Amino acid sequence: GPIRKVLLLKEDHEGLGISITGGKEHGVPILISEIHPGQPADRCGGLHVGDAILAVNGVNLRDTKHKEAVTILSQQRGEIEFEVVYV
């Protein structure tokens, strides 16, 4: 599908509210496998199961290993911009 830019608002006591799978070491993108109900990703409205996360706050995640992506994603705070695509 089309590449999309999506804004997520997270408070400091919260996680993102997603599960991710995949990573470069497995030859697949960082993929959203779950959107947890009522948490920030669900509330933002624009992130969905099956979306590949291409970048977050301008940091490319296309070639990142799984744990690299976890570190990068969990570091982001507040108003967080995602670049995603559903394939």
């Binding site: 996680g15 993102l16 997603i18 599960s19 991710i20 799978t21 995949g22 990573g23 497995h26 697949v28 496998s33 779950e34 947890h36 799984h66 744990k67 976890v70 994603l73 969990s74």
Partner: peptide, 8 residues
Amino acid sequence: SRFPTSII
């Protein structure tokens, strides 16, 4: 999951 999954 086919590959590892992390909740974040």
